[PDB]
């Protein structure tokens, strides 16, 4: 896609939007609270693929660790849903809690993530059912009564 | 001649085809809707009795 999200940025984007590190507050940040947001991100992409579903994360292939620069595979439409969904699982670590507009804007996108994963899953006929008269099932198709199933 | 003598109940020339039709035909469909609704009903009665 357009530039790539790395699992790092989105760590960073997270960390940023509540003050914790970033230029444009006062200074700072710290190594470990890097490894330690990674690997919380990669434990909820897990967990997401139960309820959300999944969405094209890219797992580790083997043991080996996560890393911040490594690519994400996500397309760059879900990194506000993925990164306010995260700031909320780590505010923890910090002792904080968030205000209500992070509430708001997280619950925003994530429905903006949500409209673009429906299904509707649109429910068939039986199999007990008859087909009428009207569509010729003796020559132009063949079985009378819906199949209902494959 | 030959030999062999039909017995048509209602037959008519419609496209260079003989159709022919008895008594039934007509309510088939009817029928088999019926059947459908008394056995949907029977077994939706029989699965909360109180």
């Given at each position: ?124 006929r039986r199999?007990?059912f ?16 819906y199949?209902?199933?494959? | ?50």
């Open positions: 896609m357009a530039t790539v999200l790395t699992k790092g940025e989105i760590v960073l984007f997270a960390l940023r939007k509540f003050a914790i590190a970033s230029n444009a507050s006062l200074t700072d940040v710290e190594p470990q609270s890097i490894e330690d947001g990674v690997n919380d991100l990669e434990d909820m992409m897990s967990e997401w693929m139960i309820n959300p579903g999944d969405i094209g994360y890219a797992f580790a292939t083997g043991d080996e660790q996560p890393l911040p620069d490594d690519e994400s595979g996500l397309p760059r439409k879900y990194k506000h849903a993925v990164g306010y969904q995260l700031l909320l699982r780590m505010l923890s670590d910090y002792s904080l809690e968030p205000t209500p507009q992070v509430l708001s804007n997280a619950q925003r996108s994530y429905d903006a993530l949500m409209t673009d994963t429906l299904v509707v899953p649109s429910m068939r199999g007990d008859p087909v009428g008269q009207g569509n010729k099932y003796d020559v132009f198709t063949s079985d009378r009564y199949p209902g199933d494959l | 001649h030959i030999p062999l003598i039909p017995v048509y109940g209602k037959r008519w020339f419609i496209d260079d085809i003989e159709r022919v039709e008895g008594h039934i035909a007509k309510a088939m469909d009817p029928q088999r809707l019926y059947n459908l609704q008394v056995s949907m009903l029977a077994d939706t009665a029989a699965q909360d009795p109180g």
